Specification:
This protein is an alpha+beta fold and 124 residues long. The chain has helices spanning 4-12, 25-32, 51-55; strands at 43-47, 61-63, 72-74, 79-86, 97-104, 106-111, 116-123. 18% of the residues lie in helices and 33% in strands. Its main location: secreted.
Length: 124
């Protein structure tokens, strides 16, 4: 099956753009990344950085994840991110999202060898 690392890339990485450029970004990306196939995923974050810079976070500041696990890491720098959140008009299969662009630190959970991001925990 798809690996956890690959799933993180598909769900969260967008190195092809520096920022969301229109209100439609989330609608397009949630659909194109297959995140709305079975249900409307309610929230998701895309990161507009190189993959290597995001993978490097696994070597940065160790912190507790929101659920208490201790394999989370916070980026030293802020990163360009886009938050996608379902709107009130969203109704499967026509899932609809609000796009918000921001520059925040990211918190990811890492696993494996090589030790890589597998879960997006939070932005702060």
């Amino acid at each position: 099956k798809e690996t956890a690392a690959a799933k993180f890339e598909r769900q969260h990485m967008d190195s092809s753009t520096s920022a969301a450029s229109s209100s439609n970004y989330c609608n397009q990306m949630m659909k194109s990344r297959n995140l709305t196939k079975d249900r409307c995923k309610p929230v998701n974050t895309f990161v507009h950085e190189s993959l290597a810079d995001v993978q490097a976070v696994c070597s940065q500041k160790n912190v507790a994840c929101k659920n208490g696990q201790t394999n989370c890491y916070q980026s030293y720098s802020t990163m360009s991110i886009t938050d996608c959140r379902e709107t009130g008009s969203s109704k499967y299969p026509n899932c609809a999202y609000k796009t918000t662009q921001a520059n925040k630190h990211i918190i990811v959970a890492c696993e494996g060898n090589p030790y890589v991001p597998v879960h997006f925990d939070a932005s702060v």
